[PDB]
Amino acid sequence: GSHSMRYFFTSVSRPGRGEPRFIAVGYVDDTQFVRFDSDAASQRMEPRAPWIEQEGPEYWDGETRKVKAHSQTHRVDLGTLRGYYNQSEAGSHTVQRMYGCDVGSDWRFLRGYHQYAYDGKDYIALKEDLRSWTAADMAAQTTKHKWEAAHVAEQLRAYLEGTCVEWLRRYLENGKETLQRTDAPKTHMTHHAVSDHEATLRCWALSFYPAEITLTWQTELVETRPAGDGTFQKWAAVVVPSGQEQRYTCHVQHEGLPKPLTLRW
Amino acid sequence: KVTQSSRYLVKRTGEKVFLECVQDMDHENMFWYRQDPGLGLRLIYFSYDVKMKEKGDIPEGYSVSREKKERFSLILASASTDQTSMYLCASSFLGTGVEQYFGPGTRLTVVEDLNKVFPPEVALFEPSEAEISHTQKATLVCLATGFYPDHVELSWWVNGKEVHSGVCTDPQPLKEQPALNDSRYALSSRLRVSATFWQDPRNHFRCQVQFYGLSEADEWTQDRAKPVTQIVSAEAWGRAD
Amino acid sequence: KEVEQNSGPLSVPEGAIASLNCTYSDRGSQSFFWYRQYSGKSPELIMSIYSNGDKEDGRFTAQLNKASQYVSLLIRDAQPSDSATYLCAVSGGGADGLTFGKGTQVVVTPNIQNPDPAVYQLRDSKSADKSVCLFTDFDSQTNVSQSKDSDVYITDKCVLDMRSMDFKSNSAVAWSNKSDFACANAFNNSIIPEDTFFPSP
């Protein structure tokens, strides 16, 4: 089915310590394939998925050089955003920006995005067209004029619709055995009493991949959470009138199940 | 946009030379180049932020200074004659795949001695009878000769007003002895008018040449006019046949 | 890892298309630039390109092909104002350096519809008995070669546009300081039409 490639950058000022922290992570679908952390021995972009390890030295210099650019940028950004917001150098601030591209089953282009935050709040975003920006407030509106002057959207659109799709495809190909696999949810139910007369049914979806899952009852739904090995766990649960367990059923829709599972008790 | 502190320069060997570059485009990166016939741009130094500097393709002879975001100084520490060139400042925003913009350039020339500096003599030559009769058109030729360095700007003035239609000045100022590195230079230009206009004695034609030489203060000892930055003109009036 | 472009001067008839091309060694590259630089002026950014295909901006057409590491610029009506050096540039990825091409010169030559080649003697307006020799009004295909003698100066051909009229013409000037030089033999050592006008008595 569909596919994503997505990068996330986070930069966090830390007054009286030193150039701020910058974390860069890159995902293909639900699997991390790269990493960069400014505070680390390497000072290189580092692999975190098996398949990506087959790109030669020139790919790792390339990505190292680009990722550093991005940190340096976000440094300048903290501080520019301070100027705009009249805040002093004594407070800790964050700057965040994610971007990436979607593709379908045929692997054609779907959507692109690029989004930027300051201290957890929306700051400026590409529109879905890829040609125009939504600005949140008046400082973001300085940025926008800046990025219009500089034809940033033209650039981002060439990337989002271009390089982005072409590199994802390549990843999808050199890593088919791990990225095109689909691990179907190991399914079961538990039952627990409470002060009467009611019982808790708990519908489990375990070690599935990708993470998109849907758990439905005829009401708690924890958020899908990683198991740590590359697969995902989730559960859903209803409190139901004791003795009436056969009236209820749990439907598990997932990309790895030829047909929707349905659970009894 | 971008300004450089000077446009033409004449300096003696060993003189230390300051070229300045100023940007008001909130740009964080700044780059200094040379450009030379046949080589193309060569990067001397760049700077991605304040008080930072990295040697470029050819840093020998040069030092830079970046105390301010809008200001990136190039210093030639002891001027040699191979430092004669076009110097270009450039700047750009920090980021991925960004574009640079250039300053107007500075043209700097380095001589063994300042006594080789000469202003142009200007003379201008009148349209031929032949050309008049043959084509009803009249061409004025202008000739600027024996100037050093090749630091001129020729412009035509018709009845007290600068003109552009029917003009063309030679793009290359030409070497009088292409052998010598210190030979004097010459340059021509042409102004073409209808014959009637030329045959009118009321029309005034000026060949103006702005020369860029020494300052009004340099050491000068010899029996000739201090070869200062100056304007030299030649004139001709319409022939009243 | 350099950038390379075809060799100058490329010669282009006014109205025709000038083809500037460019190849780069680094397949990872992502931004591509065209700079125009007139004589003794700084380069001017005139075109940026980022995705595979064609990009149009007035009379400019750029095309990028990444598979081949190949960049193109077309200039559609080649007008006179269009003569300059065109520089190819690629993002160097490293602290925003660019790698530049060496330059391609373009000479856009006029359509001289009614030529009439001539050499004329022209005299100093000042009393000085001095003299200059003007070859003018030839068609753009003729070429004038640098002087084979050492004390004889000849210029490049130069296009002038008379706009009050609808006229343009090439010319070159020649002069020497030896009083044994004349305009009969000033312009041999050049392609010169046999019909070229030399005035008499």
Binding site: D77, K146 | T96 | -
Partner: peptide, 9 residues
Amino acid sequence: ALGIGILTV
């Protein structure tokens, strides 16, 4: 692979 168009705010 990373991309262009990242520019200072």
